[PDB]
Amino acid sequence: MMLYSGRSQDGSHLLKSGRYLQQELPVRIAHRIKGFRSLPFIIGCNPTILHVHELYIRAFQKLTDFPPIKDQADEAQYCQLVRQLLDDHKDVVTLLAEGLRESRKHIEDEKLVRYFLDKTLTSRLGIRMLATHHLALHEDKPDFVGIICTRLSPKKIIEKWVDFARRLCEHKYGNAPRVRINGHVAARFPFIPMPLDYILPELLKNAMRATMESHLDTPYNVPDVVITIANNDVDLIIRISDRGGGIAHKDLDRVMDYHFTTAGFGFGLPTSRAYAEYLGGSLQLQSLQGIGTDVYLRLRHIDG
């Protein structure tokens, strides 16, 4: 899938973008529907899975019922539909999580659900990126072409999610680790924030929770979480290192499983990894049992 960076005054680029989207969305939704159709019967019969399956069918119906975009008037209305659908599907990850939680235990091939979720959630991420990019082309935000930031600062977006995770953590525990950021703190480059907006808060919540739950005697004095930024011509690496006691040997082969948690609902890690790999990067964990965990998020740079 491609995110149009084209620009024009007659607004011709919006028409071209809209037409591309109109061509592309129905095909990709059709693929998601095929995924639901192939789910093991007993899982497909779960009422929450059925609800999500039906949402996708509705999306496909509405998208295919929309006439070919001929002019700006049409394109404007197509954007209304896209906005509606994005909103109607905003809770899909949570619905799948709930729908699958019990039902998946009823089949033996455990690879199956993992594959379905990886494929479904990453396709969905790409679909939402495409659609949101098109809508964003109508915005006049400085330093954005659609959802592409022309000068993203890793430090700034990390700090945004740090503040967010610290507030949640402070609410639950009365305090939160301080976060230090080092390495290429001054880096700025073209980049799409959206995947970071998903991934960063998941990894930060994990690191903070781990830190608090291993320092229950001294909640007022916990070890910092330390984030290192490395920017090179190939990828961006963000290392998130905590002293939260590590991931136990007995849990290590399970933490990347959808639904596994030692506590939200165990999607943070497998989802983040699937997203990173979908975009050409990776998510790798290094556990120092008894000390802490290093998490390495790598995302490939944009090809201008």
Ligand X SMILES: CC(C)C[C@@H](Cl)C(=O)O
Please report, as ranges, the residues that interact with a copy of itself according to CB under 8 A: 183-184, 228-232, 234-235, 237, 239, 246, 249, 284, 286, 288-292, 294, 296
Asked if 293 touches ligand ADP (CB under 6 A), the answer is yes
By the 10 Å C-beta count (0-12 exposed, 13-18 middle, 19+ buried), 9 is classed as exposed
- The residue whose two tokens read 């639901």 is 36
Query: Closest-CB residue for K ion?
Result: 266
Which two structure tokens, joined as six digits, stand for 178? 């301080």
Is 257 annotated for ligand binding? Answer: yes
Chain centroid to CA 97? 14
- 73 contact choice in ligand X, ligand ADP, K ion, none (CB below 5 to 8 Å, kind-dependent): none
> Nearest approach, Cβ of 250 to a copy of itself (angstroms)?
9
Q: Which is nearer to a copy of itself, 18 or 246 (CB)?
A: 246
- What are the angstrom distances between the C-alpha of 221 and each of 172, 196, 214? 15, 29, 12
User: How far out from the chain centre does Cα 210 lie?
Assistant: 21
Taking CB within 5 to 8 Å according to partner kind, which of a copy of itself, Mg ion, ligand X, none is near residue 268?
Answer: Mg ion
Site for ligand ADP in 239-268 (CB under 6 A): 242, 244, 247, 251, 255, 260-268
Alpha carbon of 24 to those of 19, 124, 131, 189, 253: distances in Å? 9, 13, 10, 28, 37
41 is in an annotated binding site: no
Is residue 206 part of an annotated ligand binding site?
yes
Q: How far apart are CA 231 and CA 188, in angstroms?
A: 9
Structure token digits, residue 105: 């235990």
Binding site for ligand ADP (CB under 6 A): 202, 206-207, 210, 242, 244, 247, 251, 255, 260-269, 293
Binding site for Mg ion (CB under 5 A): 206, 268
